[PDB]
Amino acid sequence: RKAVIKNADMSEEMQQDSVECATQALEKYNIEKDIAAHIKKEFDKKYNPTWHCIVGRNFGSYVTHETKHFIYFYLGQVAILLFKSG
Amino acid sequence: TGLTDDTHTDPVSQVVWLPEPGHSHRFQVLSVATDGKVLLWQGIGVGQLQLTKLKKHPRGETEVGATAVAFSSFDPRLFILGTEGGFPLKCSLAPAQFTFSPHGGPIYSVSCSPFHRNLFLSAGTDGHVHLYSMLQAPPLTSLQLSLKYLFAVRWSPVRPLVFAAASGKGDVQLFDLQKSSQKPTVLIKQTQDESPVYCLEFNSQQTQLLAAGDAQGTVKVWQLSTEFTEQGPREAEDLDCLAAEV
């Protein structure tokens, strides 16, 4: 679950929360949808809604985010896309 | 666009793709020279081609033209040339090893062997589909269709060892090796007065899509169910290998 951030439009403190939240989610949950849900909910609480989270090993995306609210990173071999829109 | 100079003036009979030894995305394009050249190039390389030369007893009555070439999935450097002379020629390009004497009529169609690399097809004016194994070039078997010509053959390495072909009468024959040799199992017909089909091809993405072309500018698709898979058909490979060795 080593974290490597590939791209971000996010403050350093929010980047840390992204990794820490995903790290806990991956420790606690085995199922991809449940990992994603954990991460999303933690951001809605602290940074207000509406956040969206994608967690997986094989996907591409094209999305729109609110400025300064985007991160894309890996934990090991699993990619996490976390952003606000709406 | 290609060139118009001596590089490839001949009215090439066929174009085929091959994987390039480099990144798998790259596919070289070849043509079958009617004059005795083995021509390969890359995409931008269509101008100023990169490879060129099979001639047995050069500078004389030696004009090695072919009508089709097939390549074995086994190895990029194994293929057969459908020479106009009629005798299939094995070439690895120029080197050559076997002349396959069982088929003597000018060749109009060839096909590489499906898996197991032993059922190599040649067919021409003879009207007879001779299979052979490049390992020794024996006459394996000859389909004895009493038909004017043959214009296409259908193989699918994906499926068990089965055979079909389009003949110059309008019929398309199917053969289940484990049932019959000379007697078509399933046969596809044309309408009462349609002139013969002149081409046959099957979708590489199997999806049971076969296509043939009539004497009109119309291509007809059939959905075929006969060729189901099964455990056991391999026997056909052993039967052919034993026939070859005796």
Partner: protein, 103 residues
């Protein structure tokens, strides 16, 4: 750790060497006949008839192929038997067997 790996191999060996042979020739129930698909009926015909309308009136098909990637994409090329050395003779007609390709 070679002797640790060997120890594991011994334990499983004891299980497999016995279990496998017993099962292999168990000659158990052999009536399994599952298809996972409805039995297809006798081979069908005229699934689709693709062609250029006007041009197909005089031309005949000589070269066809399928796109390995777009399996829906069926290609055809008709032409005239004669005069193929001089003029433009034909076109390349492709049609998809894809969504909404009702014509």
């Amino acid at each position: 750790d070679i002797p640790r790996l060997a120890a594991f191999l011994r334990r499983v060996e004891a299980m497999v060497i016995r279990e496998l042979n017993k099962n292999w020739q168990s000659h158990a129930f052999d009536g399994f006949e599952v298809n996972w698909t409805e039995q297809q009926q006798m081979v069908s015909c005229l699934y689709t008839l693709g062609y250029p309308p006007a041009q197909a009136q005089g031309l005949h098909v000589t070269s066809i192929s399928w796109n390995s990637t777009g399996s829906v994409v069926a290609c055809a090329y008709g032409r005239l038997d004669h005069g193929d050395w001089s003029t433009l003779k034909s076109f390349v007609c492709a049609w998809n067997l894809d969504r909404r390709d009702l014509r």
